[PDB]
Amino acid sequence: STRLKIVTIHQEPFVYVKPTMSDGTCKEEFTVNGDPVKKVICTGPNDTSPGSPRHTVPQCCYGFCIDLLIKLARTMNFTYEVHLVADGKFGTQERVSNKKEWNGMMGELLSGQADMIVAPLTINNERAQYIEFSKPFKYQGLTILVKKGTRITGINDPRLRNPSDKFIYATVKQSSVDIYFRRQVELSTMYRHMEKHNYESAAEAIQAVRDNKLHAFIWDSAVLEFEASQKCDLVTTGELFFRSGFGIGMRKDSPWKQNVSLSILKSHENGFMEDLDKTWVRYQE
Amino acid sequence: DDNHLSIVTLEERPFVIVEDIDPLTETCVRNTVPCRKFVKINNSTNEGMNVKKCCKGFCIDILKKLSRTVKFTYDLYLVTNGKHGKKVNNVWNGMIGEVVYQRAVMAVGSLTINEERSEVVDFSVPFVETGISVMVSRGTQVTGLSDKKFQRPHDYSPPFRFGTVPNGSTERNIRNNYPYMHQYMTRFNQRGVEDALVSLKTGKLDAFIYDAAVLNYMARKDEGCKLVTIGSGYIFATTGYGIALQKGSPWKRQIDLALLQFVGDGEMEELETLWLTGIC
Ligand SMILES: O=C(O)Cc1cccnc1C(=O)O
């Protein structure tokens, strides 16, 4: 038939993105357990600034989601090529006019620029209306990242619920967290605060917390807790205030979808997913 | 008619709770729904009668919402041939079997999603997180399932005493993944969760391995907060409870979207607060 086009996104520790060496291959490296790190070539734009041309370059990709992709491809016997989403976004539906349009990885899957999304892609109502999700390969939720020393209780802290310009918080544009705060009227006061400060990417948000330019970053707990384990000037506070899972994304008529989900279940059940957690997520403190 | 569905469930507090109906009214009141239970006349006959009972709890609240949101009516009944689901000589019993053999359009209850069940039924998205946890008395030093006290029990004298409640997704998992542990464990099989908690509290069992959502609840409710799950409530083989439907069911899409809407709009947290809270 054809090799599957996989779209993914930069998001440590699920997807690392690094330059190739001079000869165009990826450097040999070894995990915390001594095992070789499986890397794939992934093409992506080098200019990521908004409104600029997106001409692509071969790069190296690896991490929890890349190991999961490799396991899927071996299990179900497909070949694949990987690229990074062109606009850098996870994907929301926005009004154009009366038409609506999906951006990010959702937009690429729906348009056929991608055949499968392999990424820390949150399962939610809005996307399930359009695409097919696997059963979750990772259970997690939302929490709040802050500079160490900053004291806030959680989602109900008055500096979040009765906001002012003195304490700035934000999430990632065109992400599932964006959708979440826009969807719920009870959260509308926080939504309107965040829409002035949302960041193009998680890594940019995290760095803005380190630089005391963002006071709180609301984002996925699997990601924020990993960051807090490596950068000891950053912490999470408040524990999970909403729970959600990551799933593989496919078009509703993919022939692969039943066997993808069964493989995810199998991998939870035989300890493979735990192994991935020990390798990529839970190993420092 | 085509909008009126046979649905099956199973008592497992607090997710499904079964009460007797008021004999003076024969009407379920308050926050309960009618659910019937086929009860045998004797053990030398196949005769039975359907007994009118009343059902409530966390998964019953989920069912009422689904019934309102997706627009269906139902006749809820309690399974009597097994419990959650087990394959015996290639024949499924429990709630799974009711669905496989088309006696029910869906199973709503504390029904764990796993691979071998997904080969014979379609599952909704998970609506409650679960998996496998370990309950102990506080301070018991056990890292988890892979702890050597579990994997190589006779490497200790006296050996660790630990069991599960047989025939559900927990035992199936342990049998497949840890053969020596499984064959050791069977002598500590517990008839149900209430027996297991008594065995723990009285020193007849050192550990109880079972469904994480139920164990974490029992921990939060334990009198005196003596029984805990290890790792601050750690879950091995993370999965969830799912609604089970017939393969190819045309209700699946709307059920999935409904559950995801409930989650997205915070409605699921209200149910969690209502049914799943304890003072530990
Ligand atoms: O975990 C078990 O072994 C039994 C069990 C207990 C609570 C919820 N579900 C199940 C199930 O097998 O679906």
Author numbering:
A (entry chain A): 3 to 98, 101 to 289
B (entry chain B): 5 to 284
Task: List sentences quoted exactly from the publication behind this structure.
N-Methyl-D-aspartate receptors (NMDARs) belong to the ionotropic glutamate receptor (iGluR) family and are ligand-gated ion channels that mediate the majority of excitatory synaptic transmission in the central nervous system. NMDARs function as heterotetramers composed of GluN1 subunits (with eight splice variants 1a-4a, 1b-4b) and GluN2A/2B/2C/2D and/or GluN3A/3B subunits. Hence, GluN1/GluN2 NMDAR activation requires binding of both Gly and l-glutamate, whereas GluN1/GluN3 NMDAR activation requires only Gly.
However, the electron density for the UBP791 ligand in this structure is fully continuous and substantially more ordered suggesting favorable binding of UBP791 to GluN1–GluN2A-4m LBD over GluN1–GluN2A LBD. The crystal structure of the GluN1–GluN2A-4m LBD was obtained by implementing a modified agonist co-crystallization and soaking protocol. This involved co-crystallizing GluN1–GluN2A-4m LBD with Gly and the low potency agonist homoquinolinic acid (HQA), followed by soaking against a buffer containing UBP791 in the presence of Gly.
